[PDB]
Scaffold this active site. Structure first.
Site, mmCIF file in Angstrom:
data_model
loop_
_atom_site.group_PDB
_atom_site.id
_atom_site.type_symbol
_atom_site.label_atom_id
_atom_site.label_comp_id
_atom_site.label_asym_id
_atom_site.label_seq_id
_atom_site.Cartn_x
_atom_site.Cartn_y
_atom_site.Cartn_z
ATOM 1 C CG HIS A 92 -4.034 55.423 74.137
ATOM 2 N ND1 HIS A 92 -4.409 56.451 74.974
ATOM 3 C CD2 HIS A 92 -3.118 54.697 74.826
ATOM 4 C CE1 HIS A 92 -3.775 56.335 76.128
ATOM 5 N NE2 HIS A 92 -2.987 55.277 76.067
ATOM 6 C CG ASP A 102 -6.893 58.666 74.341
ATOM 7 O OD1 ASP A 102 -7.289 57.645 73.721
ATOM 8 O OD2 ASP A 102 -5.937 58.644 75.153
ATOM 9 C CB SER A 129 -3.541 54.071 79.132
ATOM 10 O OG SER A 129 -2.439 54.834 78.687
#
EC number: 3.4.21.-
Lengths: 251, 147
Positions: free
Chosen positions: A42, A104, A198
């Site tokens: 992502h 992910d 992230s």
């Protein structure tokens, strides 16, 4: 990182910063092997329109529109040690789901390979699965409590949470925790990753090898640092085969 | 007709056909042992031909044999070459050993890293043959301690 402590310089030589050409950081990553960086899937695509919630190639971030920085310590200031490297290609897991954050994980092939040294060396792939309650280290340059950004890379040390009680904790909340995800943090809350972390590395120490192994990448967590709620990371042992097939890395 | 004199073979070589005596129009080929070639001027070759002329002389002298050179071995990225003792010889039957730059690289066994210079002038390894070894990155060993 919430409730983190400043990382000691040089002791995270596998960490990568994903940044815009401009220099503004947005995600973290990890060097694998000679010329690959594993990060969150992502991190590598535009935000999707909820009225059309499916990932297309048109939404992916172009290799020309971001760069990688290895051997970095300061968030915005500079080393010696820093190696600024262009991107060749990017590959998000074939079964990545942008809505549920499952699988992910993504692999960024570098246009130019770093010079390996005391400040830039790869993290090892995990040999086996993770034991319940292992102490891992999550590192990153993202926001902290009261929403400042740190001067320095920050890190937390947190225990791994059993997959079952992670699922039961996120229901409430209509959010699924699938086999490809691993959970960390404590019930009381506090120590957690956040916006800007992230793709950052979750690692542990092996003994008596003295080798450090990547257990997961930062994926998602509802609110940063809030009780009865655990941080969710992409379980890399689960997709070790795919990473090895694309990369050709071996320990 | 006229007899040509006894020929002496070159060191590391030979002369065929071996005859007791040689006479007008007789041809002989000069050859070298395996790992060597005939040297004329600065040119290497497999055989050189001389003939017994009418006047009882040979068309040429017997040339010398020169050991085959494998020259510069292939460069192993992130690696190092150690030659077998001092001269750094790159000629027939001599050896090198490849290594990888420690601590940030290690070699794939596969192989011993020992490449030996062949009679055909190629550097060869028992397992990989002509192909060179591979230096792989050593992971997860930081150099700075954490408190």
């Amino acid at each position: 990182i919430f409730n983190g402590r400043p990382a000691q310089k040089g002791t995270t030589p596998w960490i990568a910063m994903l940044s815009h050409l401009n220099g503004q950081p947005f995600c973290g990553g990890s060097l694998l092997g000679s010329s690959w960086i594993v990060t969150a899937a992502h991190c590598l695509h535009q935000s999707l329109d909820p009225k059309d919630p499916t990932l297309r190639d048109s939404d992916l971030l172009s290799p020309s529109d971001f760069k990688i920085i290895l051997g970095k310590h300061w968030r915005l200031r500079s080393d010696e040690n820093e190696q600024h490297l262009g991107v060749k290609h990017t590959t998000l897991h074939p079964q990545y789901d942008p809505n549920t954050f499952e699988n992910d994980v993504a692999l960024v092939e570098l246009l130019e390979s770093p010079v390996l040294n005391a400040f830039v060396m790869p993290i090892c792939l995990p040999e086996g699965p993770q034991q319940e309650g292992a102490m891992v280290i999550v590192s990153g340059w993202g926001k902290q409590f009261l929403q400042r950004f740190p001067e320095t890379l920050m890190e937390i040390e947190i225990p791994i949470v059993d997959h079952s009680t992670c699922q039961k904790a996120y229901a409430p909340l209509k959010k699924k925790v699938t086999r490809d995800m691993i959970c960390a943090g404590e019930k009381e809350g506090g120590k957690d990753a956040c916006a800007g972390d992230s793709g950052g590395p979750m690692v542990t120490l092996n003994r008596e090898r003295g080798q450090w192994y990547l257990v997961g990448t930062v994926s998602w967590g509802d609110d940063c640092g809030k009780k009865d709620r655990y941080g969710v990371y992409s379980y890399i042992h689960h997709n070790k085969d795919w990473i090895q097939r694309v990369t050709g890395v071996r320990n | 007709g006229n007899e040509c004199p006894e020929l002496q073979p070159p060191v590391h070589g030979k002369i065929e056909p071996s005859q007791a005596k040689y006479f007008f129009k007789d041809q002989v080929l000069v050859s070298c042992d395996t790992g060597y070639k005939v040297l004329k001027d600065n040119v290497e070759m497999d055989t050189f031909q001389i003939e017994c002329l009418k006047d009882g002389t040979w068309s040429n002298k017997i040339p010398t044999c020169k050991i085959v050179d494998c020259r510069a071995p292939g460069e192993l990225e992130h690696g190092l070459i150690t030659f077998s003792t001092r001269n750094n010889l790159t000629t027939y039957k001599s050896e090198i050993k490849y290594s990888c730059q420690e601590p940030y690289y290690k070699m794939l066994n596969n192989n011993t890293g020992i490449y030996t210079c062949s009679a055909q002038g190629v550097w060869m390894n028992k397992v990989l043959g002509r192909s060179l070894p591979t230096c792989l990155p050593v992971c997860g060993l930081p150099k700075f301690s954490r408190k």
